[model samples]
Target: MKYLPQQDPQVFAAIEQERKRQHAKIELIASENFVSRAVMEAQGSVLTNKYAQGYPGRRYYGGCEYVDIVEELARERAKQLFGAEHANVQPHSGAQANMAVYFTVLEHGDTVLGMNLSHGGHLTHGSPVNFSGVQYNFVAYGVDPETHVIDYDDVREKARLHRPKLIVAAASAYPRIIDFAKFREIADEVGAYLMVDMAHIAGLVAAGLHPNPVPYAHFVTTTTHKTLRGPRGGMILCQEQFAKQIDKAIFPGIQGGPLMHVIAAKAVAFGEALQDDFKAYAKRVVDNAKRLASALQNEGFTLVSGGTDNHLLLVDLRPQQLTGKTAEKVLDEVGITVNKNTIPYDPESPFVTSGIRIGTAAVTTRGFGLEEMDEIAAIIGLVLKNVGSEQALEEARQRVAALTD
Candidate 1:
C-alpha cells in the first residue's frame, strides 16, 4: 500500500474507503463475501506475473513450472471437494464457466431448457441478452405460483414439448431445495444432457446440507465465491468422459489465458473447505438464514417459498407496499447491504424488482449467530416501517453501527 499510495493516491484512497466500508457494514448481499487473509495473500502472490495459457504440463508458454503446480492443486482439490471425475478451474467467472459448458455440449440454435429469470434463475441461465439465449434456442420453466416452488411436472411437460438438447437446473434467488434427481429424471425421459449451475449453494452441497448435484448431473458449474467463501472465480466439474471436450472449450474455444493467481487463491479456499470447521460454518449459515427469515416474517415480511433451506432468503416486499429498489437503498443507508431481486411472477420490472435477496454467509463468516439475525431483522422492520422518517433512519443507523462494532 505504501508503493500504491506513492504511485496513485486516488486509487489508494478508494481502496482504503472500500476496506472501511466492508468493516463498517452488515454484509447481507447474497453473492458477496470476505475471503480469508491466506486467500487474499495467494491472490496477490507472485503467481500473478505468470501467463499460463494452457493446462498443467501442457502450457503454450515458458516459465509456467510453478503455475502448473498451482493449477494442478486447484483442479485436484475441486475434484475432491465435489467428488467429480473432472474439474476445470480456469474459467474466470461463473458466466464464463456456463459459456464454456454451452460451447462444449450445444451447437448454435440448439434448444436448451432453463429456469425463468423472473422466477429466481440467473441471467446466464437463458436471458435474451446473453450469448446463451442469442446463439441457442432457450425455453424457460418457472415455479408454481401458489407454492412458490419449482414445478417439476411443468419442467417435464416443457421438456416433452420443446425436446431441448440440454436442460439447465439452477437458480440465483431460490430459497428451497433443488431436486437434481427429479431434473435428471426429466432429462432422461427427454434424452437431454443435464447441466447444473450451482454457483450459489456450492458450500452447502459440499457440507452435505443440500443434495449433491455432482452424482446426478452430467456437468456442474460453480463460482468459488458466494457460499463457497473463496476467490472471485469459477470452476467446472464433469464426468471424465467430457473432460477433454470441456477443457478444449474453456482454453481454445473461449478464453486464451488462465489467471494463475486466482487459481491459487481458489486452491487455498478449497483446502479450507475441506476442514471440519467449514462444515460447521456452513451449517450455521443455513440456521442463521432460517432465523432471519422467521424474524422478518414475524415483522410482516413475506418470504418467497415461505422460508429458506439454504443460506439465502428472498423477501417479497409487496406486503409492505415497498419496492425492492427502495428497500435496497434504505437498508444500505442503515449499513445492511442487500440487493434488489425478482420474485416468482413478479409484477415489477427487473430494474425495480418486487423483492430483495438477503443471505447470512458474509455475516455468518463474521461470526453472527441466530440472536444477531433476530436483531438485524428487527432493525430492518424499523427502517422499512418508518422509511420517510429522519429520526427512524438515524436510529436504525446507530443500531447498525453498534452491531458492526
Candidate 2:
C-alpha cells in the first residue's frame, strides 16, 4: 500500500477511504466479513504471480511444485474441517462453485428444484435473470406465508411434481436452520441429486453450531468469506463419487489457473476454523443475531421467521410503512449499512422491496457483543422511526459515533 500510494495516489486514496469506512461504520451486510491479518498476508503474497492450472500434483503448467503443495494443503484442510470426502477450493466465488456443480450433473434444460429467491434464496439458485434459470428449468420452493419458514410438506409436494434431476437446498437470507435431513428425504423420494449451498453458514457448520449438510447432501458449496471469515473465495465439497466430475467442471469447464495465494489463505482459514476459539466466535455470532432480532422487535420492527437461529435476520419493513429502499438509504445516513431485501410474497418490485437484511458476523468479528447489538438496534430504531427528520438523523449519527468510537 505504501508503494501504491507513491505510484498511484488516486487508487491508494480510495483504498484508504474504504479502510476507514469499514473501521467506522456498522457493517450489517450478511455476505461480508473482515478476514484476519494472516489471511490477508497470504492473499497479498507472491503466489499470485504463478499460474497453476489443474489440480495438485497434476498441473498442466510447469514450475508449480510449491503452488501444488499450497493447493493440496488447502484441499486437505478444507476436507478435514468440513468432514467431506473431497474438496475443490478453486472456484472463484460461491456462484461459480454452484455453476460448477450444475455443469457436473445437469444438462441444459434439465429441471432443478431450488429455494425461491424472493423468499430467501440466491440468484444462482434460480432467478430468471441468472444463468441457472436461463439454462435450466428451475422450479422454486419457498417458505410458508403464514409461518415464514420452510414448509417441508410443500417442498415434498414440489419435489414430487417437478421430479427434477437436482434439488438445491440453499438460501441467502433465511434466518432458520435448514433441515437437511428432510431435504435428503425429499431428494431421495424424487430421485434427485441433493446440493446444499452452505455459503452463508459454512463457519457455523464447521463449528458444529449448524447442522452439517455435507452428511446429507451429495454436494455442498460455500463461500470462504461471510461466517467463515476467510479470504473471498468459493469451495465445493462432495462425496468421493462425484469428486472427479466436480473438479473437472471447476477447472476445464468453467475456470483456469487457480488463485494459489487465495488457496493458501483458505488453508490458513481452515486451520483457524478448526480451533476452539473460532467455535466460540461462531456461537457469539448467533447470540448477537438473536439479541439484535429481539431488540429490533422491541422497537416495532417485524422480523421474518419470527426471529433468527443463525447470524442474519430479514426485517419486514411493511409493518412500519417503509420501503426497503427508503430504510436502506435512511440507515446508511446514520452510518448503519444494510442491504434491502425482498420479503416472501413481496408486493413491491426488487428495487423497492419491503425488507432489509442484517447480520452480526462483521460486528462480532470486531468484538461487539450482545450489548453493542442492542445499542445498534436502538440506533436503527431511532432513525427509522423518524425518517425524513434531519434532527433525528443528526441525533442518531451522534449515537452511532459514540458506539463506533
Q: Please, what are the lDDT tens digits per residue for candidate 2 over residues 100-153?
A: 999999999999999988999899998888999999999989899977999899
Alpha carbon lDDT of each predicted model: 0.94, 0.93
Q: Candidate 2 clashing pairs? A: none
At residue 84, what lDDT does model 1 achieve? Answer: 95
> What TM-score would every model get versus the actual structure?
0.99, 0.99
Candidate 2 wrongly placed segments (more than 4 Å): none
Q: After superposition, how far is residue 177 of candidate 1 from its true place, in Å?
A: 0.7
